């Protein structure tokens, strides 16, 4: 009963960051070494937990959150960051315990003339609560006139396509991200290292 981390990190399809995908992991053995000994990841930041000790720790639930963002924005997937991604798309709590793992997906998620399939939320009235997921498409009032579901000057669609081309500066190349959260409640600890 091996954890399907393969399903998560090696997936063919990754979600848009605004409508980020969550896998709840339970009832499996997690060999964490297969991640951290990998050469495949360019960012591997862990908050409040060490990947080397997870191999003999049990948790009630582990959450795998996956999505695509551009290189420049990987640094916004951290507690206490601000910017479009942090504020309007995916928000870590201050006291986050988990790992932030990312890799360049230019070979898959770029194409000549641009991949535009990947979106982000550009506008919102207020910041996301931590781990909030907002899939509303209500017209955004940017000026002093109410929109009531009609686009115009200062009345915009809240989402926008990233433009991923293979020649793009690394800052503007697509990155796949997985975020692992660890949960330890007073219930059967079903997510265990091999030891």
């Amino acid at each position: 009963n091996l954890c399907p981390f393969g399903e998560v990190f090696n997936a063919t399809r990754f979600a848009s960051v605004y409508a980020w995908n969550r896998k709840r992991i339970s009832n499996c053995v997690a060999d964490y070494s297969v991640l951290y000994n990998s050469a495949s990841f360019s960012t591997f930041k862990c908050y409040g937990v060490s990947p080397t000790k997870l191999n003999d720790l049990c948790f009630t639930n582990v959450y795998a959150d996956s999505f695509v963002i551009r290189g420049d924005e990987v640094r916004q997937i951290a507690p206490g960051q601000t910017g479009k991604i942090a504020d309007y798309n995916y928000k870590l709590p201050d006291d986050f315990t988990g790992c932030v793992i990312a890799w360049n997906s230019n070979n898959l998620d770029s194409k000549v003339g641009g991949n535009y399939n990947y979106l982000y939320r550009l506008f919102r009235k207020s910041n996301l609560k931590p781990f909030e997921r907002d899939i509303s498409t209500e017209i955004y009032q940017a000026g002093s006139t109410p929109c009531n579901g009609v686009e115009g000057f200062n009345c915009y669609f809240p989402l926008q396509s990233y433009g991923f081309q293979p020649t793009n500066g690394v800052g503007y190349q697509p990155y796949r991200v997985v975020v692992l959260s660890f949960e330890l409640l007073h219930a059967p600890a079903t997510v265990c290292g091999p030891k």
Epitope: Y116, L122, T137, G149, V150, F157, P158, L159, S161
Partner: nanobody, 127 residues
Framework: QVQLVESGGGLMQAGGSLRLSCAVS????????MGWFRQAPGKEREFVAA????????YYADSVKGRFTISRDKAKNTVYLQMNSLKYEDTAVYYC????????????????????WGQGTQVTVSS
């Protein structure tokens, strides 16, 4: 990929009204916006109207603003161009186009090159 098939072209009198359809089949979940373009014989293909698939918000070229209506039924994956107060200068082949591109700025669908295109439907406006 999606296939676009237009209908509703024919002979109509100036001052009358005529409604074109474009039915979208295949990978329809991708549709971000639909556009209508037209090409009068030997002259440039020209932007007419665009509709964002979400919300149904519309943008028109000045040439048809106040005359034409673009609308869509999502469930039926069909976009319509309602051509009211038909004029002699409307005589042309009309093309529907589909893009999965989302811009926050609706006016950009007037300049965007789209992903898939219909076969064109002839409208002939009588004197």
């Amino acid at each position: 990929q999606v296939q676009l098939v237009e209908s509703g072209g024919g002979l109509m009198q100036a001052g009358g009204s005529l409604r074109l359809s474009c039915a979208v089949s295949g990978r329809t979940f991708s549709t971000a916006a639909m556009g209508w373009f037209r090409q009068a014989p030997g002259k440039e293909r020209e932007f007419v109207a665009a509709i964002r698939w979400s919300g149904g918000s519309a943008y028109y070229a000045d040439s048809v603003k106040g005359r034409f209506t673009i609308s869509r039924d999502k469930a039926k994956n069909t976009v319509y161009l309602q051509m009211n107060s038909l004029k002699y200068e409307d005589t042309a082949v009309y093309y529907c186009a589909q893009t999965h591109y989302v811009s926050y700025l609706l006016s950009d669908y007037a300049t965007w090159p789209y992903d898939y295109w219909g076969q064109g439907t002839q409208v002939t406006v009588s004197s």
